[PDB]
Amino acid sequence: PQITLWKRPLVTIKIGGQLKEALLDTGADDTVLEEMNLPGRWKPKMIGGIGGFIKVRQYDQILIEICGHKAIGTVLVGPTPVNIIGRNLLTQIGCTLNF
Amino acid sequence: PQITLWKRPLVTIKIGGQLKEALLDTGADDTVLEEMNLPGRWKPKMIGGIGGFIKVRQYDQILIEICGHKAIGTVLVGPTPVNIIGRNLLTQIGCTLNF
Numbered sequence A, B: 001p002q003i004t005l006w007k008r009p010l011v012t013i014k015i016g017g018q019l020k021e022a023l024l025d026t027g028a029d030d031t032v033l034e035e036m037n038l039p040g041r042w043k044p045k046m047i048g049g050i051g052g053f054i055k056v057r058q059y060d061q062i063l064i065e066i067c068g069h070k071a072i073g074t075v076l077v078g079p080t081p082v083n084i085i086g087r088n089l090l091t092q093i094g095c096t097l098n099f
């Protein structure tokens, strides 16, 4: 579909068998999701933006469905204020910016 | 144009007469630029990101050219890690996400 930017580009996703709302964010290299107890191996990481850094846990090869489009890639989990779908997954669903 | 997301959507902007590089950031409500000198009056403001809140200088009704498209809106200047073009200006140039 086509998503205008009058409001935040929030969409429903499915990850680890759970539905969530997430931001289609062209400004994020990789995907960051709210704290959640996913299974499997992870590695700790620090990610930075406006206001400084937060500590996250990096999971690899995580399956996320975005408006019916399936994607698989890296996901950082930590105390982010919003779920953020980054370019690593936006490319897999064929998402582009158009103007 | 149509912009794919396998690389950062960086563009050249023109503001205050000078050229700069900025990131098209659909996850940003607001446009925030690194420290610079801009003409006109400004007021203190706060903005929050992934890591917390920072103080910025809010310039209103600033003319800014984004890859040849003109916009006139609010520009925040402060300690952002990256120059980001937010939805307040992306809407002015007709940006949408498509997939």
Ligand SMILES: CCC(CC)CN(C[C@@H](O)[C@H](Cc1ccccc1)NC(=O)O[C@H]1CO[C@H]2OCC[C@H]21)S(=O)(=O)c1ccc([C@@H](C)O)cc1
Residues within 6 Å of the ligand: A025, A026, A027, A028, A029, A030, A031, A032, A047, A048, A049, A050, A076, A081, A082, A084, A086, B025, B026, B027, B028, B029, B030, B031, B032, B047, B048, B049, B050, B051, B080, B081, B082, B084, B086
């Ligand atoms: C300048 C920071 C960007 C460029 C370095 C990167 N960021 C994405 C950007 O879209 C954030 C997303 C966001 C949205 C709401 C609340 C917190 C964060 N938007 C944002 O800061 O916008 C501000 C201005 O406008 C206002 O509205 C929104 C909040 C205000 S990130 O989140 O920090 C981030 C950092 C590392 C990684 C690794 C994993 O790749 C992934 C994602």
